[PDB]
Design a protein around this ligand. Sequence first.
Ligand SMILES: *[C@@H]1O[C@H](CO)[C@@H](O[C@@H]2O[C@H](CO)[C@@H](O)[C@H](O)[C@H]2NC(C)=O)[C@H](O)[C@H]1NC(C)=O
Ligand SMILES: [Ca+2]
Lengths: 130, 130
Amino acid sequence: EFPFALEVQTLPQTCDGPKAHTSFQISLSVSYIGSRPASNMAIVDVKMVSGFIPLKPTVKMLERSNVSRTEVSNNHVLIYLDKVTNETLTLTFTVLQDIPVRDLKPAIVKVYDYYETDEFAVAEYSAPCS
Amino acid sequence: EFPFALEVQTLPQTCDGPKAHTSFQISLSVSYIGSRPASNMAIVDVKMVSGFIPLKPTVKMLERSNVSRTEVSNNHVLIYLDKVTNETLTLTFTVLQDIPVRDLKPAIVKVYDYYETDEFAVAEYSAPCS
Ligand SMILES: *[C@@H]1O[C@H](CO)[C@@H](O[C@@H]2O[C@H](CO)[C@@H](O)[C@H](O)[C@H]2NC(C)=O)[C@H](O)[C@H]1NC(C)=O
Ligand SMILES: [Ca+2]
């Protein structure tokens, strides 16, 4: 059982051209559906597809939201959500191909409450030209 | 006084804390109150407060209603309505502070008929912490 609804899409969704190989946006949607009225502070952890890096200003721009901190470390983007309720929060940022890698595999995204254990969900996404 | 009724408010309405400095919602309401039964195609044109930009997905979200399309362009948000009648349409979207600018002055919102140059309204709004 997952007390968060988590889904991830890319923009573009398909390998629709040369540009889709070297850059795409990641678009995450999250809400809280568990036993409590709402989450506490929560973290969304996005792992990068192999060879991809996040574009810093589009990560920092998420802080303008209902997000109070972000971090880029070790090929992960961390997003600190203030509070998650039954309303869907959508977050979008850009990634860039730093190193082309063959055989691109899916990357996992996790969301978890910062303070209560076993309040988490997982999902995955792929580069559009995988 | 205009053949359109046009009102604009921001969420939050005042500078209620740190987050009000860096993002807010723009909420506008419009109806046609003129001689004619309804307006033709009308355009709503929202100019950004200095330093702010729209959160594009919340603009694109408007596109389902009397709303035939939206555009983000040269730091205006443009909303195309197929027709406007006496019933009030409310449209709400998010803007984000990209760069902090000193001394924020009010920004203009317009609605006008695609054909009748005499049929327009104007209203002002300010960033909550301007
Ligand atoms: C971040 O969360 C806030 C909640 O505080 C959202 O603000 C609400 O937005 C809706 C929809 O436009 C309004 O109907 C509510 O009145 C707002 N409430 C407040 C307290 O402002 C906001 O939409 C969220 N920002 C996102 C989703 O990016
Ligand atoms: Ca649990």
